[PDB]
Design a protein around this ligand. Structure first.
Ligand SMILES: Nc1nc2c(ncn2[C@@H]2O[C@H](COP(=O)(O)OP(=O)(O)O[C@H]3O[C@H](CO)[C@@H](O)[C@H](O)[C@@H]3O)[C@@H](O)[C@H]2O)c(=O)[nH]1
Ligand SMILES: [Mn+2]
Length: 345
């Protein structure tokens, strides 16, 4: 009996994403319902929140300086949340050598988290477009910012983020959901919002971890569009040490985000399938996997040996990488739900 539910749960667990992926690939066929406008030239405020990133901060403001967006339409706000290792002290060094780039560095009381810093920065922002970008993120081309901005021209588009590149099943979901209506996941490498909507929201909330995705999703719910077009590209920043902990800090942010998002309001009809499927994939399906694993483990230790064959196959499939990064993602999600439940105390 426990092999029965193990294979049922395995079927349900792997079938949910594959069916969703097929519906995404049919969304991917339709043409964009909005167009980037290359002559659109709004005032743009780029906000870099920093706590202890000195090597990265000098590479980062180099990266923003090198953007080809008209410098009279651009300003940077760097927010240090009262960090120790003298990154503000590097920041005005870079500001000494680059005076023609409009810059305001703003220092905090002490660290109250990223969203709170973003709201402080927001009361300095003067642009029509507000771009959040993490300090460890580098834009690979001198037109990355301009490309995001072209996509913000349409009045229905409220937010744009990048696709990440060097299983790009992920990127398919991103731009398919983008074309359908909105994608509920944004990337901190580049998150661009129309400031009028941030003011209506108002600001970023301090209780969700995935600031970008939460704002993007709130803008989608408001009847605006939140998209990651394929030509707005950033390279993912990988931390190095503590990779699993970092990936689990991000799973936990996605789990908090989707948990709060589906307990609020009604999505525009084209968005409610998107929201519910991605909330399912982040909050439900991961549990099906290790429950099946344990039922097979019990059936193996006591009695049956088709069960133990299924687990041994499971390992032999741990050799090839797509299945590896899938089951490890499910692992991060389950760990995250656990740490989420026990952290609030
Ligand atoms: N001012 C300020 N800045 C902060 C703080 N914490 C982090 N930052 C800055 O925010 C960026 C990311 O900080 P991380 O600690 O590395 O966060 P993360 O794990 O990399 O995740 C980030 O991106 C995710 C989305 O890709 C988000 O889930 C998350 O909220 C954050 O933006 C960096 O530029 C960092 O200096 C803070 O408390 N105060
Ligand atoms: Mn980071």
């Amino acid at each position: 009996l426990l092999e029965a539910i193990a294979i049922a749960l395995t079927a349900a667990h792997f079938g949910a994403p594959l069916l969703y992926y097929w519906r995404a690939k049919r969304w991917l066929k339709k043409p964009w319902d909005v167009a980037p406008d290359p002559t659109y030239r709004p005032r743009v405020t780029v906000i870099v929140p920093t706590y202890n990133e000195a090597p990265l901060i000098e590479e980062k403001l180099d990266n923003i300086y090198e953007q080809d967006y008209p410098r009279d339409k651009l300003e940077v706000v760097v927010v240090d949340s009262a960090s120790t290792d003298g990154t503000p002290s590097a920041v005005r060094r870079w500001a000494e050598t680059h005076p023609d780039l409009a810059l305001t560095l703003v220092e905090e009381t002490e660290r109250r988290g990223k969203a709170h810093a973003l709201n402080t920065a927001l009361r300095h922002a003067t642009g029509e477009i507000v771009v959040i970008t993490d300090a460890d993120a580098l834009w690979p081309a001198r037109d990355t910012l301009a490309n995001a901005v072209k996509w913000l021209a349409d009045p229905t588009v409220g937010a744009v983020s990048c696709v990440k590149r060097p299983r790009d099943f992920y990127n398919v979901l991103r731009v398919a959901e983008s074309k359908a209506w909105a994608t509920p996941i944004f990337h901190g490498e580049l998150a661009a919002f129309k400031r009028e909507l941030l003011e209506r929201l108002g600001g970023f909330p301090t209780d969700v971890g995935a600031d970008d995705s939460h704002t993007a999703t709130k803008i989608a719910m408001m009847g605006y569009r939140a998209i990651t077009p394929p030509d707005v590209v950033c390279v993912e920043a990988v931390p190095k040490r503590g990779y699993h902990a970092w990936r689990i800090r991000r799973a936990q942010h996605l789990v908090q985000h989707f948990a709060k998002a589906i307990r609020d309001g009604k999505a525009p009809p084209p968005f409610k399938p998107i929201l519910h499927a991605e909330a399912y994939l982040h909050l439900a399906n991961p549990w099906a996997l290790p429950t099946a694993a344990a039922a097979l483990a019990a059936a193996a230790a006591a009695g049956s040996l088709p069960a133990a064959a299924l687990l041994a196959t499971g390992a032999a499939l741990a050799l090839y990488k797509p299945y590896r990064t899938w089951t490890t993602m499910q692992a991060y999600l389950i760990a995250a739900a656990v740490k989420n439940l026990w952290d609030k105390e």
